[PDB]
Amino acid sequence: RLLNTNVDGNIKIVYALTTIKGVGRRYSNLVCKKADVDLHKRAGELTQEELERIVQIMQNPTHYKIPAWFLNRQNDITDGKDYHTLANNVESKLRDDLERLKKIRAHRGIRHFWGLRVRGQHTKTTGRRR
Amino acid sequence: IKLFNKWSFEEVEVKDASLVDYVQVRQPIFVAHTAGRYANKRFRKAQCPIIERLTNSLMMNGRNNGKKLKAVRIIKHTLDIINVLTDQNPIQVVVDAITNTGPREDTTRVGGGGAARRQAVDVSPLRRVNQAIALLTIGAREAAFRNIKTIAETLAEELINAAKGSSTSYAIKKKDELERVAKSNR
Amino acid sequence: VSVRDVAAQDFINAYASFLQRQGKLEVPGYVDIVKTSSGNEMPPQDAEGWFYKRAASVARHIYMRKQVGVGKLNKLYGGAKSRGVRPYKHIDASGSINRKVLQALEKIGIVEISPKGGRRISENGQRDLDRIAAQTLEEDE
Amino acid sequence: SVQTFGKKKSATAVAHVKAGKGLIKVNGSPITLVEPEILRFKVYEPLLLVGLDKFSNIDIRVRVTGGGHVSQVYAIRQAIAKGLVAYHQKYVDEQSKNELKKAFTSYDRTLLIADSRRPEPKKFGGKGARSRFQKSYR
Amino acid sequence: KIRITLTSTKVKQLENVSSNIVKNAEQHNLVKKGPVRLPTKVLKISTRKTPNGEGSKTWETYEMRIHKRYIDLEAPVQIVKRITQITIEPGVDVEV
Amino acid sequence: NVWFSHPRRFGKGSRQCRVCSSHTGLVRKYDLNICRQCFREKANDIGFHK
Amino acid sequence: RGMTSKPAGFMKKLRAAKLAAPENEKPAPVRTHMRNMIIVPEMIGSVVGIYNGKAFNQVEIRPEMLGHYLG
RNA sequence: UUUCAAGCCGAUGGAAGUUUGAGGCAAUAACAGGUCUGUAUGCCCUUAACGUUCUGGGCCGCACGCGCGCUACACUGACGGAGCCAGCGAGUCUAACCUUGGCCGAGAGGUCUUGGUAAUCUUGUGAAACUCCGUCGUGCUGGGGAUAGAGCAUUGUAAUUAUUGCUCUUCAACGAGGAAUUCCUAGUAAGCGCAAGUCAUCAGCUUGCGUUGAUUACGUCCCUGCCCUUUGUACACACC
């Protein structure tokens, strides 16, 4: 048991963690070698020592090449994860954020009512996904 | 002459007699034969005919992106593989294969609408070289793509099946196809 | 010999062994927060943990070019269109690495500051380079 | 002294040829060190070609700017060759023209004359590069 | 070195003024490092003749051949003043 | 239009042609020319510029 | 974003807020198509009316929102 | 070889062959070809307004179709570290290009100091393809990347509509495409980077450049355009 709700096992550690919303394909390997286990190693082969090192990084913050790093938060007083954000936390925050500025006329809130892009990326041909 | 300052043509026996007259191992057309490497893997065998025409057909078909810079490593690094495997000169084995993959009589096509008129034309030496290497590389690039095999292992394995004679080989089999339809529709 | 006679990569590895011995050069702890947080396993030559291998590279470049600038030993001189440019505006990841490395090498007596901007390489510097280049060359022959 | 030129694909090979010593200096670093890769047998190529071996014989000091590892190994090579014919002995050196023409023999893109090649783009109208399209007998 | 530079349109006006500095300014008291040529201060470009509109198939090559000579005067003694005698050939832009 | 020297914000009064009113990609070096159009015309008049 | 050294709060709407707030909160949506302003605490309550394109979609401005632009 | 003509075919000499490669040149005329939105301009018009000014929103809409580019479906390789190399062009005249030195700091980001350059310096060897070696091992993956959400700048007023980009995270279509159709003739397409042009500011475009560089014509039967002679005509507002 590492995650909130989910649990990995049996398959290679990179494949086995992909089923988590918060740990993907080229995002599993990030946390894996920070614990200090390899990619070929399967998640059902893990020793207690190896199991402890992986969950410590994964629930608390993740990184890559970060020499400058503060920990400021939202300023709006809903929640405040902002370390690393796993399954049950990423489905909550990202959901109700969209609803708060949709309640008012933010223009990002009205693009959430439409269907069209929120950032506004070259809008003519894109729109078959969003 | 000396190919990568070791192997030459003086330790090589030649099979087809008319290829002695035309294609000379001086430079036109260079009778030193070797190709079959990508990355680092020492497989088994080597072989691909005429190094001048391994700049030619072998390059563009590949299978590789990149042109000559790829090709010169394919040519060079496979020389050592066959040297310790069958204990042969890398040129000698495929001086057998070049005449087997090169037709004597071929067929032209001329397209009169949706009609393929295959009529016979004679070959003789020069075209037999490059059209044979075209036959090797087109079968090799597609066999690297369509099943799990690198261009290293594909080019390598092919040419002893082409040299001795087997229906596993592409190049002797398509040589048969083009040659026998010429002597039929003559 | 000189630094030219020995190869590029393996000189940087060989010099890095002696670099760790000298306790003026410490790790301010930046590259242990990148290679582990990746997936990347790099074995002990490739490894760089980190100020030892990077100091050996930077100091080699003051033999090979020699002229001024901490900035012109940070990125070669101009072209950081690959990876990230930083000239006037406040210095980033690459910045805080190389300002520290030539500061720490100065506290040995490896690099000195020449009066037309920035660094050269001095007496104890090129001793610590090319004497190690000789030892590696004897292992090559 | 005896010097000479010799370029292909843009290069300036400033090849001095001199009696006494036999160290091959390329700019301000030796032969093995400037060109560490694979193709650097080519800069040692027209040296042993003449008959006798080098190091014992003639000193070579080149300067070169312009040209990749593909270009430079021919530029230096071509300049050593073009400076060989212009050299002085006792019989002297002019007929080494014919043996540098016989270097890459019988399909003469030799070492006397240049590789007159400058790789620029790809063409419109048929299929094209260098060596003309469509032939059964090639 | 006292840097004189000349630049003009074409060859015909340029030959006279360049040769005149060797004749007039230079004598014995001046040593120049001498009358050089240099590459042209040119600006070439290939574009299209019709400026955009009908016809992609049309071309026009352009240049501005503005032939420079440097011709530097080394010795900065008395004779560097006598350049004020030559004021001939306008179209030659003299710059010091 | 643009030719009034006091726009509201800094970047409103953009660039325009002298000859025509036209706007659509002018030239920095010559503030005249419709867009591309009088560039090649006024080359054929006298002289050239890059 | 403009926070340090001069945040981009457009001066016309500061004049609007000092008028309309100390009287009575105006229950009709005041149209305010200005996007480029920082929102300030004297704008809380009163219905600001930013345009979108084809439609409008009612503001209720809360004391929790202050820090951002109208975005 | 050909009539012992003109020419072809190959070879020698050389850095270079049959107008050397690429531009520049567009006859006489026709298509009542296109441009009244470049300016010029006949005449028709409209004139408390098919004038002018203020500001927002539109040109980014959409329920489908068509044309042209970009990117991928891969070991054709990806990922990490190290290393070797080109050419064409830009840069205030009083708002330049850029080297340096320290300080905010999750990004896009300049006030100030010092030094070089009017192009000697600088953009550019922190320039890729490529090469070396190791790992992944054919599974929608270590493939591919749209989309979304999450931490900021003493200026460019200012980037919700409508900016690029950087780190974590989200990890789709797609696994080589029917009927059918286009381009690619010997350093000038493919593949590969680099620079200019408009530009306060948004390229995959246009424009210009170098690096690595080849499969294939036997033969004009058929297709489409063009030229010459011969040939039939009742065809003639241009030979709809």
| DSSP code per residue over D71-122 | THHHHHHHHHHHTTTT---SS-STTHHHHHHSSS-SS---SSS---------
Closest residue of chain A to G69, computed from CA coordinates: A106
Beta strand pairing status for E67-69 and E5-8? antiparallel
A68 touches chain C (CB under 8 A): yes
Q: Which residue has the tokens 């032969």?
A: D31
In whole angstroms, give the CA distance from residue G65 to residue A76: 7
Contact (Cβ atoms closer than 8 angstroms) between residue E51 and residue F39:
yes
Query: Pairing mode, if any, of strands E60-62 and D12-19?
Result: unpaired
Cβ neighbours of C66 (radius 10 Å): 11
Cβ(B29)–Cβ(B53) below 8 Å: yes
Contacts 24+ apart (CB under 8 A), D48-55: D49/D99, D49/D100, D49/D103, D50/D84, D50/D96, D50/D99, D54/D22, D55/D22
| Chain-chain contact of G61 with A106 (C-beta, under 8 angstroms) | no
Determine the Cα–Cα distance for residues A12 and A38; give it in Å rounded to an integer.
9
> Is-contact C55 C104, C-beta < 8 A?
yes
- Residues 6 or more apart from D114 whose CB is under 8 A from it? D6, D7, D8, D78
- Rounded to whole angstroms, the Cα distance separating D120 from D9 reads 10
CA distance B61 to D118: 24
For tokens 């300030």, the residue is G40
- Strand H and D39 CB separated by under 7 Å: no
Method: cryo-EM
d(CA B92, CA E82): 83
| Whether residue F12 has a cis bond before it, omega within 30° of 0 | yes
Q: For residue C112, what are the contacts with CB-CB under 8 A and spacing of at least 6? A: C106, C119, C120, C121, C122
D21 three-class SS: coil
8 A C-beta contact, residue B120 and residue B107: yes
Strands E72-73 and E32-34 turn out to be antiparallel
Q: Would the CB atoms of D106 and B27 count as touching at under 8 Å?
A: yes
CA distance F46 to F13: 31
**Whose structure tokens read 């009088």?**
F38
Least Cα separation, residue A99 to chain C (angstroms): 34
Query: Could you tell me which residues are beta bridge partners of residue G69?
Result: G38
Q: How far is the CA of B76 from the C1' of H238 (A)?
A: 71
B59 CA, H29 C1': Å apart = 53
Q: Evaluate whether chains E and D are touching (3 or more beta carbon pairs less than 8 Å apart).
A: no
**Rounded-to-integer distance, Cα B158 and Cα B167, Å:** 11
Distance CA E23, CA E28 (A): 11
Nearest CA to E23 out of E68, E66, E71, E69 is that of E71
Interface probe for A, chosen from G3, G44, G65 (most Cβ of A below 10 Å), is: G65
CA C13, CA B77: separation in Å to the nearest integer? 28
Beta bridge mates, B106:
B121
Secondary element (H or E) of residue A7: none
Residues 67-86 of C with CB under 7 A from strand H: 68-85
- The residue type found at A120 is G
Closest CA to B153 of B37, B71, B34: B37
CA distance G60 to chain A (A): 6
CA closest to H25 C1', residue:
E60
F29 touches strand H (CB under 7 A): yes
Residues in chain C: 141
Element (H, E) at D124: none
Helix, coil or strand: residue E60: strand
Assign A23 to helix, strand or coil: strand
Q: Which residues of A touch G64 (CB under 8 A)?
A: 76-77
Greatest Cα pair distance, chain F, in angstroms, is 39
Identify whether the C-beta of residue C77 lies closer than 8 Å to the C-beta of residue C47.
no
A22: left (phi over 0), alpha (psi -120 to 50) or beta: left
Q: Which residues pair with D2 in a beta bridge?
A: D17
Q: Resolution limit in angstroms?
A: 8.9
Q: How far apart are CA G57 and CA A73, in angstroms?
A: 28
d(CA D76, CA C97) in angstroms, rounded, equals 40
- Dist CA A61 CA D65 (whole Å): 51
> What's the CA gap between C45 and C10, in Å, rounded?
8
- Sign, CA dihedral D52-D56-D57-D60, equals positive
| Binary contact (D36, C7; C-beta < 8 A) | yes
Q: How many Å separate Cα C22 from the centre of its chain?
A: 14
Q: How far apart are CA C39 and CA A39, in angstroms?
A: 8
3-state class of E8 per DSSP? strand
* Count of residues making up chain F: 50
Burial class of residue B128 in the structure, from the number of CB atoms within 10 Å of its CB (0-12 exposed, 13-18 middle, 19+ buried): buried
- Chains F, C in contact: 3+ Cβ pairs under 8 A? no
Query: Would you say the C-beta of C41 is within 7 Å of strand H?
Result: no
Spacing of A105 CA from H82 C1' in Å:
55
Cα–Cα distances in Å, from A75 out to A27, A67, A72, C49, G66? 28, 24, 9, 38, 9
Q: Using an 8 Å Cβ cutoff, are A108 and G71 in contact? A: yes
| Two structure tokens written together for G2 | 């403009």
End-to-end CA distance of chain E: 11
Contact C56, C125 (CB under 8 A): no
Per-residue three-class SS string for E77-88: CHHHCHHHHCCC
Q: What is d(CA F21, CA F35) in angstroms, rounded to the nearest whole number?
A: 10
H or E segment and range at residue F37 = helix F37-45
Token pair belonging to B75: 């040519």
CA distance F10 to B155: 67
- Chain A, nearest residue to G61 by Cα: A104
Q: Which residues pair with D24 in a beta bridge?
A: D60
Look up tokens 């070049």; give the residue: B98
F9 by DSSP, 3-state: which?
A: coil
Count of alpha carbons within 13 angstroms of residue C55, beta-carbon side: 30
- CB D51 within 7 Å, strand H: no
Q: Is the CB of C119 under 7 A from strand H?
A: yes
Give the whole-angstrom CA distance, residue A1 versus residue A23. 15
DSSP label of G2 = -
F37 touching chain E per CB within 8 A: yes
Q: How far apart are CA A33 and CA C41, in angstroms?
A: 8
Longest dimension (CA), chain D: 56
Dihedral of the CA atoms C104, C107, C109, C112 (nearest 10)? 70
**DSSP annotation string for chain B:** --BTTTB-STT-----SHHHHSS-SSSTT---------SS---S----S-TTTTTTHHHHHSS-SSSHHHHHHHHHHTHHHHHTTT---TTTTHHHHHHHHS-SEEEEEEESSS-EEEEEEE--SHHHHHHHHHHHHHHHHHHHHTTT--HHHHHHHHHHHHHHT-SS-SHHHHHHHHHHHHHH--
Residue with tokens 């299209």, as numbered in its chain: E48
CA distance D92 to D107: 27
CA G57, CA G71: separation in Å to the nearest integer?
Answer: 13
Least Cα distance to D110 among D16, D5, D8 occurs for D8
Non-local (6+) Cβ contacts of B33 within 8 A are B47, B48, B49, B50, B51, B90, B91, B94, B95, B98
**Cα–Cα distance measured from residue B176 to residue A48, given in angstroms and rounded to the nearest whole number:** 65
CA distance A17 to A28: 6
Helices (H) and strands (E) in chain C, counts: 4, 0
Query: What one-letter code names the amino acid at A91?
Result: E
